[PDB]
Design a protein around this ligand. Structure first.
Ligand SMILES: *[C@@H]1O[C@H](CO)[C@@H](O[C@@H]2O[C@H](CO)[C@@H](O[C@@H]3O[C@H](CO)[C@@H](O)[C@H](O)[C@@H]3O)[C@H](O)[C@H]2NC(C)=O)[C@H](O[C@@H]2O[C@@H](C)[C@@H](O)[C@@H](O)[C@@H]2O)[C@H]1NC(C)=O
Ligand SMILES: *[C@@H]1O[C@H](CO)[C@@H](O[C@@H]2O[C@H](CO)[C@@H](O[C@@H]3O[C@H](CO)[C@@H](O)[C@H](O)[C@@H]3O)[C@H](O)[C@H]2NC(C)=O)[C@H](O[C@@H]2O[C@@H](C)[C@@H](O)[C@@H](O)[C@@H]2O)[C@H]1NC(C)=O
Ligand SMILES: *[C@@H]1O[C@H](CO)[C@@H](O[C@@H]2O[C@H](CO)[C@@H](O[C@@H]3O[C@H](CO)[C@@H](O)[C@H](O)[C@@H]3O)[C@H](O)[C@H]2NC(C)=O)[C@H](O)[C@H]1NC(C)=O
Ligand SMILES: OC[C@H]1O[C@@](CO)(OC[C@@]2(O[C@H]3O[C@H](CO)[C@@H](O)[C@H](O)[C@H]3O)O[C@H](CO)[C@@H](O)[C@@H]2O)[C@@H](O)[C@@H]1O
Ligand SMILES: *[C@@H]1O[C@H](CO)[C@@H](O)[C@H](O[C@@H]2O[C@@H](C)[C@@H](O)[C@@H](O)[C@@H]2O)[C@H]1NC(C)=O
Length: 524
């Protein structure tokens, strides 16, 4: 347990990530774009920087970056949600109505579906929210435990006025997605056919079903279906606390979602992000025609420090989701382009050489609010999770960057590539020496990333105080983590290009932008 100082703790607050004024924040709730505003809701504890007393916080922005706080949307003030207003999604009907479905928890820990809607649809800020007088609207079916009945998805249209929603759950150890039909969002009929099921995964929370285009570069409206359309099915795997997705096809007539590759099904395949990244939710953005993904990153320090600093957890910069057309077997996640409006000034590092076992300093000034874009070239079984990080030297790795580093390398956070034997390219983030404090996470995170002939090894890094977001090969693989250094803070945080390979030297070109505050404050 580290004697954290006020100066060390205040430094952890983010400059441009969404974060409430104080206290605990969790799952993204009912993201929508309505009347010129991006709407974001989130699990929020009014009382303490720990999970509990769940309410829905509410915030708005013109651009998905410059957020403005609004009053609480939903409180724990009805018998059916007295134990908490858990997560939920929004469906926007063609008549202009917004239906917000959420799970409310009773004093007996019973989870039941409820309906909320705006008190005034003419208000673009959607400040006030009303709970349907006839709540609660749906309780667990005979095969599902009433204490584990959660997370209604955004609905998709069938025909004749009927919509479909997904509620994840489990049969014994099999993860499942149930589908309910409705016409009025007040009565729900359980379909006999499950959306999909995968053995040995466990509880599926926060289930997401959405379509992706195979030809374009735009997101698809949630109800879009066809023979040229593929469907991503995503679930939060409760037992692991990590989000998994799979690429497949969905048939309206059958209601079955079928994976493109059974060996990479939901829960046993790929993730949006290989780091700390949970309860991810997507919404369709009509203005720029994107599908955007929200996900929260938990603190990786001690609860003692969380209580000391008075706040816990952040949301990541929202990302676009698009099908990787060059592989056909993964998605591409990339920060929304509006993050670039935070860029103040740039510095370029052209063709910087880094020999075997070397470390090259990159003078950028302050290295705590950065947007880094780098390309790597190599001049003329492994597993990130069980590797020794940047210390484990190989013939063609590890090489990459050192963020949140100290002058004398006493604290460092490597984000790196590793080429192992055909070639498997690994992308990892190494926490093992991030901080001199022992009451923080020290794991090494990462996975393989596809690298195609003719491509340079590229990485993007978003450095924002206590949170780093990393992107390999244009977003084929992402790693989000938290850092809590004791010395590598304020002016003392440095950036390094590093090569700890033995067999080769690397040549990197970089560009580094300093990043402004998102100026997240209350609404005017
Ligand atoms: C979750 O796990 C439980 C416990 O294993 C499953 O219940 C078990 O179902 C078995 C059938 O697959 C039962 O075994 C045999 O039943 C047949 C029926 O003709 C008989 O020939 C023979 O005498 C066996 O007993 C077993 O009795 C039962 N175990 C318990 C403790 O209840 C459960 O399956 C689900 O519930 C049962 C009651 C059936 O309705 C199944 O169809 C149903 O799937 C597992 N849950 C799921 C969703 O698969
Ligand atoms: C790379 O190395 C890591 C760390 O060893 C592997 O992840 C670990 O997988 C273990 C299972 O193979 C998990 O350990 C336990 O599994 C048992 C099942 O018998 C559970 O009952 C128990 O609760 C444990 O969880 C463990 O969760 C996991 N460790 C960590 C730190 O994540 C990894 O395997 C891969 O990742 C895991 C999360 C799954 O997705 C696997 O399917 C997947 O293969 C190793 N990857 C390799 C060898 O390819
Ligand atoms: C590149 O690889 C080298 C070789 O692994 C890395 O140097 C090694 O760093 C580790 C971690 O700090 C050192 O282990 C330490 O040992 C000391 C006692 O000697 C112990 O007090 C610590 O608790 C820790 O276990 C190790 O000394 C050192 N090895 C060598 C040969 O230098 C180096 O850090 C890597 N470069 C990076 C990450 O930029
Ligand atoms: O906040 C409600 C919302 O969160 C979800 C998905 O994140 O899971 C709820 C869940 O998570 C909490 O569990 C423990 C609290 O004991 C805490 O360590 C963790 O950080 C929390 O996120 O709560 C129950 C426990 O009561 C767990 O089954 C589950 O992980 C989602 O299901 C829900 O809508
Ligand atoms: C939810 O609200 C209640 C009443 O306002 C708070 O007391 C809870 O705080 C927790 O419970 C009290 C009795 C004490 O043990 C404190 O240490 C706890 O944090 C609050 N619940 C949560 C989970 O923050």
């Amino acid at each position: 347990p580290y004697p954290w100082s006020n100066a060390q703790l205040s430094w952890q607050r983010t400059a441009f990530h969404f974060q409430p004024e104080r206290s605990w924040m969790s799952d993204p709730d009912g993201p929508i774009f309505y009347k010129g505003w991006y709407h974001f809701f989130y699990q929020y504890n009014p009382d303490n920087p720990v999970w509990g007393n769940n309410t829905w916080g509410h915030t708005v922005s013109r651009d998905l970056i410059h957020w403005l706080y609004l009053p609480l949307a939903l409180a724990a003030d009805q018998w059916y949600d007295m134990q908490g207003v858990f997560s939920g999604s929004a469906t926007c009907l063609p008549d202009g109505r917004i239906m917000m479905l959420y799970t409310g928890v009773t004093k007996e820990m019973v989870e039941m579906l409820s309906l909320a809607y705006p008190a005034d649809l003419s208000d673009p800020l959607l400040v006030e929210w009303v709970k349907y007088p006839g709540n609660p609207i749906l309780s667990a079916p005979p095969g599902v435990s009433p204490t584990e009945f959660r997370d209604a998805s955004t609905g998709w249209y069938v025909s004749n006025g009927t919509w479909r929603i997904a509620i994840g759950a489990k049969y014994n150890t099999t993860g499942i997605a149930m589908v309910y039909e409705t016409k009025d969002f007040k009565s729900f009929k359980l379909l006999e056919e499950l959306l999909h099921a995968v053995p040995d995964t466990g509880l599926w929370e926060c289930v997401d079903l959405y379509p992706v285009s195979t030809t374009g570069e735009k997101g698809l409206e949630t109800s879009v279906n066809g023979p040229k359309v593929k469907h991503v099915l995503k679930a939060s795997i409760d037992e692991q606390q990590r989000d998994y997705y799979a690429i497949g096809t969905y048939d309206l007539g059958t209601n079955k979602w079928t994976p493109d590759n059974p060996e990479e099904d939901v829960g046993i395949g790929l993730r949006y992000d290989w780091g700390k990244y949970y309860a991810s939710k997507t919404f369709y953005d009509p203005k720029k025609q994107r599908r955007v993904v929200w996900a929260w990153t938990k603190e990786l320090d001690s609860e003692v420090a969380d209580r000391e600093k008075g706040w816990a957890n952040v949301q990541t910069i929202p990302r676009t989701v698009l099908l990787d057309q060059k592989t056909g077997t993964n998605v591409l996640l990339w920060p929304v382009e509006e993050v670039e409006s935070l860029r103040l000034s740039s510095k370029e590092f052209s063709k910087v050489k880094a020999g075997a076992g070397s470390v090259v300093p990159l003078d950028v000034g302050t290295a705590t609010q950065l947007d880094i874009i780098a390309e790597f070239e190599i001049d003329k079984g492994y597993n990130c999770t069980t590797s020794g990080g940047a210390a484990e030297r190989g013939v063609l790795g590890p090489f990459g960057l050192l963020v949140s580093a100290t002058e004398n390398l006493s604290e460092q956070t490597p984000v790196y590539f590793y080429i192992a034997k055909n070639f498997k390219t690994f992308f990892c983030l190494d926490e093992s020496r991030s901080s001199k404090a022992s009451d923080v996470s020290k794991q090494v995170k990462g996975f393989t990333v596809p690298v195609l002939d003719g491509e340079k090894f590229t990485m993007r890094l978003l450095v924002d105080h206590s949170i780093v977001e990393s992107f390999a090969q244009g977003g084929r693989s992402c790693i989000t983590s938290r850092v809590y250094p004791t010395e590598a803070i304020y002016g003392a945080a440095k950036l390094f290009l590093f090569n700890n390979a033995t067999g080769a030297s690397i040549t990197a070109s970089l560009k580094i932008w300093e990043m402004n505050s998102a100026f997240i404050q209350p609404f005017h």
